[PDB]
Amino acid sequence: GEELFTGVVPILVELDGDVNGHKFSVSGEGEGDATYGKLTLKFICTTGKLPVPWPTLVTTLVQCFSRYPDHMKQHDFFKSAMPEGYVQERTIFFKDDGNYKTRAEVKFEGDTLVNRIELKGIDFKEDGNILGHKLEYNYISHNVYITADKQKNGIKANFKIRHNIEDGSVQLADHYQQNTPIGDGPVLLPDNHYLSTQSALSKDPNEKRDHMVLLEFVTAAGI
């Protein structure tokens, strides 16, 4: 699978979401260059206004584009599962608010890497930081801690995203993740390590639809 990532790969993302009965869709397009752990993406809310803050959807909206150092290449589950792909599931617990549960399939469709996602949010406060749109549109930088899951022939991960609220405080989003291969071939089950991830959020000045531009870097480390 690693052979598939040696140059620049086109990405497509498609998300259907329902948070407290507020239904929405997001489409994304861009490119990934795993050699440099580099992702360039643009996401569009295709149903009108996004009912949650864009920063809360970043993590859900392709860790196969991580740069694994040469000395850690035997720990890259994500690429090993390609082209058949993997299922990525999360529960994201927003402290003192609701939770997202997400299920995604990440696979190649020809030469394009596709991430198709369903997201379901419940228990949110209607005037809280998520449904009330109180989060800053900020750089996001944290480590994704990975461990092997031998029973599912895959991995688990956990991490905390600290979203700045507009009043200077923090909205914690505790992430629990599991990935399992779609195909039955061998996959690389890693030793414990992390992905150092940085996502820079911006706007396209010519774009009038509700949208998010991202420049993201993802680098494996810890060994």
Side-chain angles (χ1 to χ4, degrees), residues 1 4-125 128-150 152-223:
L4 283 62
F5 288 90
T6 51
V8 177
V9 177
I11 300 164
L12 300 169
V13 188
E14 295 291 320
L15 178 149
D16 286 331
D18 176 333
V19 173
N20 276 43
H22 302 275
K23 299 168 175 293
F24 59 100
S25 301
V26 174
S27 65
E29 306 182 13
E31 305 188 313
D33 193 356
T35 300
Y36 305 98
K38 182 177 184 177
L39 288 159
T40 53
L41 298 154
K42 180 178 166 187
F43 299 97
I44 295 295
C45 178
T46 58
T47 48
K49 184 179 202 282
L50 195 67
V52 298
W54 279 105
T56 71
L57 293 187
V58 166
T59 60
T60 294
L61 291 163
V62 291
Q63 293 173 321
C64 50
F65 289 98
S66 294
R67 183 179 71 82
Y68 273 76
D70 183 77
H71 78 280
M72 298 180 59
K73 289 228 180 262
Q74 68 271 44
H75 301 291
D76 189 346
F77 166 80
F78 308 99
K79 294 183 191 61
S80 86
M82 296 295 163
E84 297 85 5
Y86 54 77
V87 178
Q88 177 161 301
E89 292 165 279
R90 304 206 178 95
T91 306
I92 302 165
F93 295 100
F94 294 86
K95 184 177 168 67
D96 300 314
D97 210 337
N99 61 90
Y100 298 163
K101 290 180 174 85
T102 69
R103 187 180 186 283
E105 293 186 12
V106 183
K107 73 191 74 180
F108 278 86
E109 293 292 351
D111 297 314
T112 306
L113 184 289
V114 178
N115 180 19
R116 292 176 179 94
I117 312 139
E118 291 178 299
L119 177 150
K120 183 69 161 288
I122 64 172
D123 288 328
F124 284 92
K125 293 168 184 179
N129 295 320
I130 289 74
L131 292 176
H133 294 282
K134 309 187 189 185
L135 296 186
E136 298 182 342
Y137 194 76
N138 287 349
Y139 194 68
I140 311 169
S141 185
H142 295 285
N143 294 339
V144 171
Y145 296 92
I146 297 175
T147 202
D149 188 353
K150 278 207 149 269
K152 296 296 287 300
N153 194 36
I155 60 168
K156 294 190 194 302
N158 71 283
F159 57 101
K160 292 185 176 45
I161 302 294
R162 295 182 209 274
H163 298 291
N164 295 343
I165 304 165
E166 62 199 10
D167 69 355
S169 189
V170 177
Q171 177 60 68
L172 185 61
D174 282 297
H175 286 57
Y176 294 88
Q177 176 178 334
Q178 65 189 34
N179 298 59
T180 48
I182 291 169
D184 194 57
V187 292
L188 299 174
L189 303 185
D191 291 342
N192 292 0
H193 67 284
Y194 65 89
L195 309 180
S196 177
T197 312
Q198 301 84 45
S199 299
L201 288 53
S202 65
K203 299 292 184 180
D204 175 354
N206 299 310
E207 178 58 69
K208 301 303 193 325
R209 295 170 291 179
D210 200 358
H211 74 284
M212 173 178 70
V213 173
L214 292 180
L215 171 65
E216 177 165 300
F217 296 92
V218 199
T219 311
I223 299 184

